[PDB]
Amino acid sequence: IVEGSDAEIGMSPWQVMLFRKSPQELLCGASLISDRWVLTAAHCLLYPPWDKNFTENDLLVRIGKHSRTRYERNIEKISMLEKIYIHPRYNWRENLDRDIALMKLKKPVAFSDYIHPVCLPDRETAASLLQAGYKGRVTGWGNLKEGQPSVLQVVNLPIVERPVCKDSTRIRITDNMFCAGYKPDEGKRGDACEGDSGGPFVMKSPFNNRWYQMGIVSWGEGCDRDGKYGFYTHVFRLKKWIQKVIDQFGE
């Protein structure tokens, strides 16, 4: 996160850490969607251009975290995965189109003050909130500058109208994506960066006072660049896939 600030304690209790067993390093962010289900960017697991192809045995999930680096002794929960699911049509070849995957925890997690799930949007919640100008909030332990934070970082960014999204890049933008950031004229900055991937883009509904996950941190060009924007997988458009997997495999 660039130009963000320290998260308060318990501010984002769905925030997960994707952590490699050995070497020990932070793969990505992620989010807790129920007691045995974590949502992330498919590209944090599968990215053939970089030779990344992680399996269940490769990783750990760290929930309840605040500190990037410390083992948060009676706070964080660490889990093992039973199964990994990547969208069947995820596009790693040209644009990270669908960039979404689900991870099934080996055993359900017990909720606490620091560990709580986020809601998934319904057609109606999406329709009224995913609007240009509406701000959402991103969180992660990634680079601070296009450098690694001590605690969880947070930033509030406004959704940008499609056209502006399209006109900022040479990459083909699909409907499964949206972009967020301030305009150069706007005189407020911030963005996600390298290491924030797979974390949540969240909005608080004004109707029922609940937190909803709208986006997943996907990609960008550099971080916090004037006239550029971060790109996020549009969670609502991929919901049927999500339901599909949970219904065939869990809950």
């Binding site: 129920s34 799930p117 909005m203």
Partner: peptide, 29 residues
């Protein structure tokens, strides 16, 4: 659950507000 999803134990549940959530709500026009 996800029956209590999006309600943070240390904030919504106690009726406390985080330091910048109002910037969100205020943007919802």
């Amino acid at each position: 659950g996800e029956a209590d999803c999006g309600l943070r134990p240390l904030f919504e549940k106690k009726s406390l507000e985080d330091k910048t959530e109002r910037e969100l709500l205020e943007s919802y026009i």
